[PDB]
Amino acid sequence: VPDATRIGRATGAKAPEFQELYDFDAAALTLTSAVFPYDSQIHRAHVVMLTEQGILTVEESATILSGLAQVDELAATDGSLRTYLPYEAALKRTIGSVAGKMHIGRSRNDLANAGKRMFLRDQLLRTIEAVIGYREAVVHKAADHLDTVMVVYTQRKEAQPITLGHYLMAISENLAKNLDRYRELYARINLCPLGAAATAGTGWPLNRDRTSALLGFDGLVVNSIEGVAGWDHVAEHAFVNAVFLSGLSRLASEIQLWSTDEYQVAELDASFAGTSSIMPQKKNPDSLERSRKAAFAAMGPLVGILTSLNAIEYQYSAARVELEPRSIDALIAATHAMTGVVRTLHPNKERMRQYAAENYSTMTDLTDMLVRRVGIDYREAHEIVAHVVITAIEKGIKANKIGLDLVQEAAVAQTGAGINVSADDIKDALDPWQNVLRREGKGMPAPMSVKASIDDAMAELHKDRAWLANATQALANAKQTLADSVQQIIQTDRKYL
Amino acid sequence: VPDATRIGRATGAKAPEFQELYDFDAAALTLTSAVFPYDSQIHRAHVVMLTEQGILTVEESATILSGLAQVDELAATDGSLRTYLPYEAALKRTIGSVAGKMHIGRSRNDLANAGKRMFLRDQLLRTIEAVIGYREAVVHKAADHLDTVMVVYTQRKEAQPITLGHYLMAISENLAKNLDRYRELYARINLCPLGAAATAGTGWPLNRDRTSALLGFDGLVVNSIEGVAGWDHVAEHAFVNAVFLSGLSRLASEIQLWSTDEYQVAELDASFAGTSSIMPQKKNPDSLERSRKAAFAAMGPLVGILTSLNAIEYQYSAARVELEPRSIDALIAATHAMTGVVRTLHPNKERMRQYAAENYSTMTDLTDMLVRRVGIDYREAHEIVAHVVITAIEKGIKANKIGLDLVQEAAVAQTGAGINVSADDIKDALDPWQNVLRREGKGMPAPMSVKASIDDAMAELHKDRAWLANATQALANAKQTLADSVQQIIQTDRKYL
Amino acid sequence: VPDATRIGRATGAKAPEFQELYDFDAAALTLTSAVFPYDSQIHRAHVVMLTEQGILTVEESATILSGLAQVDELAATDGSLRTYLPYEAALKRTIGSVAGKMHIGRSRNDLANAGKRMFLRDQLLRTIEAVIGYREAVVHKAADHLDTVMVVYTQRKEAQPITLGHYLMAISENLAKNLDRYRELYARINLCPLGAAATAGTGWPLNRDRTSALLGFDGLVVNSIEGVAGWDHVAEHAFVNAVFLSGLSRLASEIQLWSTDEYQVAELDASFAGTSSIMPQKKNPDSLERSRKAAFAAMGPLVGILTSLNAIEYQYSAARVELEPRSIDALIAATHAMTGVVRTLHPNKERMRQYAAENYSTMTDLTDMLVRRVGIDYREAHEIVAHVVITAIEKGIKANKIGLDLVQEAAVAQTGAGINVSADDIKDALDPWQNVLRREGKGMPAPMSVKASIDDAMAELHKDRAWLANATQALANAKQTLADSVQQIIQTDRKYL
Amino acid sequence: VPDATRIGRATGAKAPEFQELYDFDAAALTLTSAVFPYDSQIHRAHVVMLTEQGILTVEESATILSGLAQVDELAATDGSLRTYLPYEAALKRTIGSVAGKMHIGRSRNDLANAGKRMFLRDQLLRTIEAVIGYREAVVHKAADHLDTVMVVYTQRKEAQPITLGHYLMAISENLAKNLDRYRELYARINLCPLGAAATAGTGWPLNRDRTSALLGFDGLVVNSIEGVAGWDHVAEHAFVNAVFLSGLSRLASEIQLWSTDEYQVAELDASFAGTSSIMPQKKNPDSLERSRKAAFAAMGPLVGILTSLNAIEYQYSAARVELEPRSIDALIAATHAMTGVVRTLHPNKERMRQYAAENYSTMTDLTDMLVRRVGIDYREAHEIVAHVVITAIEKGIKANKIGLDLVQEAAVAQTGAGINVSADDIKDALDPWQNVLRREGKGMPAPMSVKASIDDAMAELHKDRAWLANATQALANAKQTLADSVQQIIQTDRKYL
């Protein structure tokens, strides 16, 4: 059965990144189902530590640890066993009374806090990976468009000449700082609240550093109230999602205006556009609009979370709003989709050059030139060139046909004085590619300037990937160390007692 | 004329920190008036740099720089001269045509972006100072209450025994991470977008590193689009305010429940409470409620800013919502007020000890004890002690009068079996101060454990102050260097030409 | 298998209304799956109208209408057939080319707009029903507590004596105005945008009034742009949910403070409370806190929707945020839960009377009495009674033991003058039940005053139910008329051609 | 001194409506200063009623009422006398002890609640007036553009031909429903909570209907808790502002795209555009962007208010966020500005007709035609016409040059079959003005259809104005009745005692 939406101008298949936008909603787990595997890790690491502290005998420990494996498999099909007390009770039906001892010196409060942190931890690494993939597409694309002269806009009005590479490296710098936000957040998420128990700790001599290490954390949430009452990292995760997607919305909006029937300076790749069920001519920006809709929706969780924190005391509370899997799934899908839009975007280079040359974005260089040559102040030069534009529009003269006669009229009509400049000066000022070549300082659109910041982004991307790799490898190490300690106890009990 | 609100039980004056809450609203500047002094700094630093680059002659430079001083003084009483173009025009009326040359290679876009950053920069240091003052009061107060036994709550129900020092050190840990957020933000605020001009730079050979250094920045916003289109730091500043104040709201809510007529475990200092104009008995928590109202209002700017970013392209845009002075003024007033509430809070130690001993917060230790002594699993022990509570309530027995007979009944009625524990074990378990002494791991309420994290917070506060001092001193250095360079040009022109 | 959470003090089963809070999240449909049955109604009504307009022959119509039945059944298990174009294509595989003609003069834009309206329509009636059930429990409960003297609070400080019936009738008045909001909204939701097609109508001679009537609408969205671009009713639905649940959060917070270990003026019914997995004494207000969490989350959709509307033009747009089934499901569950909390709430009448008599909420009547008897101004009387309270607290005198000596001291110590009142006046003023009986104006807690507004709420509830019944019956009528017209065409084609 | 921003292409003065956007921020009152005149009305009406109830002697009443006049004048320059207790104390310094008796049976709680309602009441009428002025400009403008053929957009892609009048009447229908929202809100704002006193009424025999009538209310907030705890009308006022401005943002965004350098289908009037301080060619849409920024900011108050309601009990609370004067002032300025933008907008009719004829918005009529003539299903016809567009773009054929050869190619290349239609059918289908004339059902762009809904909007606007007039006149009547009753008492005391 074919894809019934790939009709008319929607040729080929949806790009896989484009399809994500339609799939994540119905495939998203509940928070309960997504956190549940991490709770089971906590059960194992907590029991291991209880064993190493002499609170559980090695017999008791091995019986429990083997029960968790059995119950974990039951809960794969029985959703009711995914909250703690149903889980504990089913473990008691599987190995008996000893099951209850896995909760010594522990609570649902610090269990839930740790499990949700572990879930948000992986989803944070999942996000950093996607945001790195987003930046790479952006930077790779910039490197191919150092010569693609085009206008930049301000207030949705043509401003000055630049290049597509210049524009894309603004997104790279936006994404670099969003990656810092995410890494900063990670340091506060990857703290372990286990050992806080209900909110006040326990008399049982737990080793909180041990449970924290086995579960992949880089440190502890020290104070026990903060361990269960702390939620600011949930609000911050929601925020960074919101702020990052707002920049993604702006790019998607920028590209959507580029690809209007009236601009026609860019065209979406067919694999990222849909059609209309009624209007055959439509090549619709469904990818851009559905991506932005995910950006708008990220406002919701952030507001919900902060409202819930403003409404309570500094306590554990069941009234606090969560950051849900479906919210992150939406962020990932949009990020993947815009990664694809950017990689496959088709710039219409000739109409780009045309707008830059004809629609008066070069007037600033005409103004600056009068100031460089005849030495008038900028406000006066600006007033003359304004008259030039006003007159040229009235007379239908495109910017690149503006000449000496017209510049002389405006100076006269505005100051009574002529102005001492040559036809060649005007010609230089009105050449959009020279507008680019002259803007060669740090962060400006000249090729050697944009290439320089691309090289910097290359070096920064290598560090981004390195940070991601070390963080991913660290969690894998602790996960492997935990699985070893678990088999160690199960085999020790099997052989020596 | 006396303060007509200090009547009835509202004895003495309002605490000055309490009065701030009523004064900041009517005293708050507009964004235009608050940013305007920083724009004038930018005019000076930008002109200095234009001079050092040979774009302005030293004569032109000195004439401009002297004009800014004159116009700055005019604008102290003429509000209309506080936006750029009115300012430029009044400088032209004061020194003539040369005034226009101060805008060479510059725009209102990067001017405004830099000026607002400078304003938010100082207000960020102002906030860190207040948040440090908030943490100091919290930690100083904790150090005096290592022995103040009291219950901690979860879900607004008495949970386990702790101390006031333990509770306050949860706030200290919350504030430490909010200080990290603010310092992380500072690094992104203290970047200079000047040199971006409209959005694309300029042909004029500016030294952007020079203007950035003279104005106190630690680096550049490199890409020129990001220089004018970047706003994520405004949204992040709004967020950290929102999240930090949400924790402040929770403490104020915690203290407000403490000081209810029904709890009576704490009392606000008279200088932080008001009365009722109708009900003479009221000692009202106006300080707490008005502080929380500031926390709720901080939701607004954050949402407004992110909405505006979701609604535009990646451009300079006049449609973006600002972070207003009055919003920060509200944060500061609430922070100062809660600094005062915490310092002067009166804990009712005896009723604190009473609740801890009588209202069953010690039952967990009774449960843990059965598990330590007779070795039953925790779920079974928990079921027995639950029956103990149910029966003791039915019979009006306070927790600390629970004895061997009752524990034996419940075990029998629940398991058919007696339970092998002594009267002295039960007595230990039910002593609320021993509940505290036994919770002696990291982050737990035992005095030696709370004293340990106080010492850590002492060391962290010293670093907080050091970071603040270095950051404040750096801006003062650059401000002094700028003022010197300005006088240098004015005196060079006066003597040699 | 028993409910593993019903342990300790959590005796019996969860109340069914309480269980809803834990079930709705995993059971909630996607917007696609919830709107899909209504789209199929639209297909039928649209085709019927096309037939009555002579755009489809009766043969074509019957073939289509029979295909929809077949495809509807396929889509019950094939989720992919629940968006339009997959559905149309599968109808074409089932009856052939004629399938395409069901889309004549129609678009996905006005189809989706109408289908979502129909979904929100039923969910709005579902909400009004639940909110009526909420008000009935509130009013029924008030009628049983005209004598339950208790203090009302302001700023979480005891204010004046009232009764539980008085308090509950404030909620009834809050709910009456929320029912008006919902009915006002309904009139704007129940308008039909079908006939707008893409956004501009069509040349095909549709009868829009006909399609609107067959689908249960009370009128048209007239202008065709408004038909597809209109979304304000989605934002308003989100808002009323948010504002109504905020009042529900406040009641749940009110009851949660009532049921603290320190207040003890009310107790949740065991079927609406949980326990702790660690602390056996806990009787936790899970119902209240989880209900409030739904109130906080309703902030999200509202903000998401309005953000999306602020970010677009006045057009159809795929970027607009929806009101999702899971959001409404949360509202319903919380409303049902608080309906149960209110019905089964256990007021502790004796401790209610005790607080009212001892904790100084009667001082206003003491103040008013001095003004009635000796004729001093209220500010002076208020200052005397304030001194009375201050002294009585210092000396440990409960309010109801305040006598003539004390009142005379305070007047002397404050004015130098005695005060001409009798021991019996003071005794009257300090009797909390007389405080109630004297507050007998409109809306005040005296029994005859509260009974009067209960009778009014009875009459209003009868009208609420009548409006609901007429609105439900109207949709059922149109649904039946539609099903008849569909069978009419299928049988006409079967017999005569 | 001239307006230094009216330079370059910013010719003439700012339109006064445009200037409002820059003035309201610095001119906005605090909530305290804006509510204060209404509090003084309440003092008068409350005292009058106390007199009519025999609680005050006519001597006492006249002394008070004359004092309020004196103190009102003092508070015009002394801001400290604008909150209640400072005001009462200064009235006591002016007429003596009797001043205190004006507060009998009253509180700051119901005083503040009523005063803020009165303030929001007038500001609501102020808003309805502005929104009516907005709709009139929209409808007046539509009536002049029944022939202005232009494309409508969906997803920012050209959709189908319409007219400017058709588009504007979508805004009129949006505004009609926003006027209903505002009138619905008004009925809940114009209820009087006075008589509730602290929260529970009073023993003093007040006539609440009397005070309510003298102050212009149409009814009472009956229950006394609801009288002081009720805030839902504040949240609803914030919402309707937010939702209405979101529609205003969308129009401003629509017009801003119209007026891009690339669309050029509309141009802002010079009096509603600014220029750039650097780029002389800029004709910037400052009016549109600053209007949208007001729409985004209206998100803030709404969120702040609902957060504060979610964070408290159902009580009077000083923690509730207000709707501030500056928020409404922003709404009014934007509404006035867009009223001016719409009235003075310059449509470029020829380029409008050009886009409609050349850029393929007529393809739906080409598709519908194949279905009408040869009877193929819509999906097949749609696939053929899609191929037509794809081929015509490839070959550079504008829509209106599409002919029989091309249509025949596509049918063949897509179905193998030719298609039985004439050159004249195709020509009809591709004529954009006939696309309009054929869309002649309810709400469609045909002139006789748009003229019909203009006549309806005319009739609705007359009713809008009538409702506004009756509501304004009613408040003026009660204000005059109050002023009479006040002079009555002052003159009665002067003559007879």
Size of interface A-B (CB pairs under 8 A): 350
Cα–Cα nearest to B294, from A315, C242, D320, C246: D320
Resolution in Å equals 2.6
Write phi, then psi, for B219 (nearest 5 degrees): 165, 180
- Are A382 and D261 an interchain contact pair (Cβ–Cβ within 8 Å)? no
- Are D4 and B311 an interchain contact pair (Cβ–Cβ within 8 Å)? no
Residues C253 and C276: their CA atoms lie apart, in Å, by 20
Report yes or no: A375 at the B interface, CB cutoff 8 Å: no
Q: Which structure tokens are listed for B268?
A: 């606000």
The answer to whether the CB of A191 falls within 8 A of the CB of A218 is yes
Residue type for position B8 = G
A236: left (phi > 0), else alpha (psi -120 to 50), else beta?
Answer: alpha
Kindly list the residues from chain D whose CB atom is less than 8 angstroms away from the CB atom of residue B247: none
Minimal-distance CA residue of chain C relative to B368 = C278
The reply to whether B97 sits in an annotated binding site is no
The answer to whether the CB of B322 falls within 8 A of the CB of B241 is no
- 3-state secondary structure at position D284: strand
How many Cα neighbours within 13 Å face the side chain of B292?
30
Binding site per annotation, positions of D for succinate: 107-109, 276-277, 282, 284
How many Cα neighbours within 13 Å face the side chain of C486?
24
Q: Which structure tokens are listed for D135?
A: 């709709």
DSSP secondary structure string, A194-246?
Answer: TT-TTTT--SS---HHHHHHHTT-SSB--SHHHHHH--HHHHHHHHHHHHHHH
Minimal-distance CA residue of chain D relative to B100 = D277
The answer to whether the CB of D131 falls within 8 A of the CB of D175 is yes
Report yes or no: D94 at the C interface, CB cutoff 8 Å: no
The answer to whether the CB of B55 falls within 8 A of the CB of B102 is no
Chain A closest-CA separation from residue C84 CA (Å): 9
Q: Which structure tokens are listed for B317?
A: 């845009």
B279: left (phi > 0), else alpha (psi -120 to 50), else beta?
Answer: beta
Residues D122 and D41: their CA atoms lie apart, in Å, by 14
Residues D154 and D175: their CA atoms lie apart, in Å, by 21
Name, in order, each residue with C-beta under 8 angstroms of C305's C-beta and a sequence gap of 6 or more: C231, C234, C235, C238, C320, C321, C322, C323
In B45-165, at which residue ranges do the beta strands (DSSP E only) sit? 149-154, 157-163
Name, in order, each residue with C-beta under 8 angstroms of D96's C-beta and a sequence gap of 6 or more: D63
Rg (CA), chain A: 30
Please identify which residue in the block is written with the tokens 């006149």. Answer: D473
In B190-265, at which residue ranges do the beta strands (DSSP E only) sit? none
The answer to whether the CB of C439 falls within 8 A of the CB of C449 is yes
Write phi, then psi, for B377 (nearest 5 degrees): -75, 165
The shortest CB-CB distance from D303 to any of A7, A303, A355 is to A303
For residue A266, list its beta bridge partners.
A347
Chain D closest-CA separation from residue A186 CA (Å): 28
Q: Which structure tokens are listed for A304?
A: 């919900």
- 3-state secondary structure at position B194: coil
Which approach determined this entry?
Answer: X-ray
For residue D433, list its beta bridge partners.
none
Kindly list the residues from chain D whose CB atom is less than 8 angstroms away from the CB atom of residue A8: 382-383, 386
Residues B27 and B37: their CA atoms lie apart, in Å, by 17
Kindly list the residues from chain D whose CB atom is less than 8 angstroms away from the CB atom of residue C438: 203
Write phi, then psi, for D301 (nearest 5 degrees): -50, -50
How many Cα neighbours within 13 Å face the side chain of A168?
32
Around Cβ C474, how many Cβ atoms within 10 Å? 14
The answer to whether the CB of B74 falls within 8 A of the CB of B90 is yes
- Are B310 and C306 an interchain contact pair (Cβ–Cβ within 8 Å)? no
Q: Taking CA B431 as the corner, what is the angle to CA B425 and CA B432, rounded to the nearest 5 degrees?
A: 140
Please identify which residue in the block is written with the tokens 């599409």. Answer: D402
Residues B434 and B412: their CA atoms lie apart, in Å, by 27
| Residue A436 host element (H or E) | helix A432-438
- Are C300 and A296 an interchain contact pair (Cβ–Cβ within 8 Å)? no
Name, in order, each residue with C-beta under 8 angstroms of D353's C-beta and a sequence gap of 6 or more: D149, D150, D432
How many Cα neighbours within 13 Å face the side chain of C414?
23
Query: Residue B376's Cα: distance from chain center in Å?
Result: 47
> Residue-wise over D203-242: b if at least 16 C-beta within 10 A, else e?
bbebebebbbbbbbbbebbbbbbbbbbbbbbbbbbbbbbb
Residues A130 and A141: their CA atoms lie apart, in Å, by 17
- 3-state secondary structure at position C129: helix
Give Cα separations from C47 to B471, B488, C55, C90, C114 (angstroms): 72, 85, 9, 17, 15
How many Cα neighbours within 13 Å face the side chain of C186?
22
Residue type for position B99 = A
The answer to whether the CB of C489 falls within 8 A of the CB of C65 is yes
- 3-state secondary structure at position C89: helix
Chain C closest-CA separation from residue B439 CA (Å): 15
The answer to whether the CB of C44 falls within 8 A of the CB of C68 is yes
Give Cα separations from A264 to A8, A73, A214, A355 (angstroms): 20, 56, 56, 10
**Which of D239, D246, D281, D293 to probe the B interface (max B CBs under 10 A)?**
D293
- 3-state secondary structure at position D186: helix
The reply to whether B107 sits in an annotated binding site is yes
Query: Residue B357's Cα: distance from chain center in Å?
Result: 36
Please identify which residue in the block is written with the tokens 């393929």. Answer: D360
Report yes or no: D380 at the A interface, CB cutoff 8 Å: no
Minimal-distance CA residue of chain B relative to A249 = B310
The shortest CB-CB distance from B290 to any of D276, D284, D318 is to D318
Cα–Cα nearest to B130, from B222, B20, B34, B204: B20
In A19-124, at which residue ranges do the beta strands (DSSP E only) sit? none
> Cα torsion for C20, C25, C30, C33, to the nearest 10°?
-40
- Are D303 and B299 an interchain contact pair (Cβ–Cβ within 8 Å)? yes
The reply to whether C284 sits in an annotated binding site is yes
Using CB atoms, list chains with 3+ pairs below 8 Å to chain B: A, C, D
Q: Which structure tokens are listed for C61?
A: 């119509």
The shortest CB-CB distance from B303 to any of C286, C303, C361 is to C303
- 3-state secondary structure at position B192: strand
- 3-state secondary structure at position A159: strand
Report yes or no: C269 at the D interface, CB cutoff 8 Å: no
Name, in order, each residue with C-beta under 8 angstroms of C379's C-beta and a sequence gap of 6 or more: B7, D88, D92, D97, D99, D100, D103
- Are D310 and C249 an interchain contact pair (Cβ–Cβ within 8 Å)? yes
How many Cα neighbours within 13 Å face the side chain of B142?
30
Q: Which structure tokens are listed for D276?
A: 């750039």
Rg (CA), chain B: 30
- 3-state secondary structure at position A161: strand
User: Chain C 152-181, CB below 8 Å of chain D: which residues?
Assistant: 152-156, 159-162, 166-167, 169-174, 177-178, 180-181
Chain C closest-CA separation from residue A206 CA (Å): 16
The shortest CB-CB distance from D84 to any of B198, B277, B300 is to B277
- Are C282 and B355 an interchain contact pair (Cβ–Cβ within 8 Å)? no
